[PDB]
Structure 1
């Protein structure tokens, strides 16, 4: 579980979005596993605006923060899970690391801010859904 709170936006894994998220939807993309909803409170996370390929992510299933190298966001095939069938996920960054389903929502961060959220796992890789291309998250 986990979310990005930036301005009046909540960024969550699409597959973990709640009733309230869908009732307050701003934007969602299944191919990216992202959903943004609106919030009453003004959050403080800052989105990274960079092409960093190094960061630290939080892994709930190890209660650990891991420094990682990750690939630039790309179109990646991802085997079937409990929420999606085997399919190409877009804007996905891979790293060597630990990722179980409940690790989804863990944040990947660089010195510039939030890079993305855990979205995929298995075969010793962790996949993060990039948010650095969503410029509109910084305004309105």
Structure 2
């Protein structure tokens, strides 16, 4: 589990979204496994605006933050998981590392802020849903 709290937005994995998230929906995209809902309180996370390929992610299933290199956000074929069939997922970045279903929502961060959240796992790889192209999270 986990979210990003920027401005009056909450960013979560679409497959973990709550009733309250859908009842306060701003934007969602199945293909990216992302959903954004509106918040009453201001959040304090900063979204990275960069093309970094190194950062640190939180892995709840190891209680550890791991430094990783990660790929450019792309359309990647993902194996079936407990929450999606095998499919193409867009705006996904891979690293070599551990990720199980409960790790979804863990933050990937670089020197510029939050890059994205854990979304995929298995096969010795971790996949992150990028948020750096969602420039509207910085305003409004």
Cα offset, 1:82, TM superposition:
2.0
Q: Which runs of 5+ in 2 are unaligned?
A: none
- When normalised by structure 2's length, the TM-score is 0.99
Cα offset, 1:84, TM superposition:
1.3
Once residues 92 and 84 of structure 1 are traced to their aligned partners in structure 2, the CA distance between those partners, rounded to angstroms, is 15
Once residues 86 and 122 of structure 2 are traced to their aligned partners in structure 1, the CA distance between those partners, rounded to angstroms, is 13
Cα offset, 1:81, TM superposition:
1.4
1:46-87 superposed Cα distances (whole Å, 9 cap, x missing partner): 000000000000000000000000000000000111221111
Once residues 85 and 98 of structure 1 are traced to their aligned partners in structure 2, the CA distance between those partners, rounded to angstroms, is 20
Match of 2:106 in 1: 106
Using the TM superposition, name which of 73-82 and 55-64 deviates more.
73-82
Q: Which runs of 5+ in 1 are unaligned?
A: none
Cα offset, 1:116, TM superposition:
0.3
Once residues 126 and 95 of structure 1 are traced to their aligned partners in structure 2, the CA distance between those partners, rounded to angstroms, is 5
Cα offset, 1:23, TM superposition:
0.3
Once residues 56 and 81 of structure 1 are traced to their aligned partners in structure 2, the CA distance between those partners, rounded to angstroms, is 23
Match of 2:65 in 1: 65
RMSD: 0.4
Aligned-partner SS, 2:56: strand
Using the TM superposition, name which of 82-91 and 34-43 deviates more.
82-91
Aligned-partner SS, 1:122: coil
Once residues 82 and 34 of structure 2 are traced to their aligned partners in structure 1, the CA distance between those partners, rounded to angstroms, is 16
Cα offset, 1:99, TM superposition:
0.3
Q: Which runs of 4+ in 1 moved over 2 A?
A: none
Structure 1 position 29 matched with structure 2 position 29: yes
Aligned-partner SS, 2:20: helix
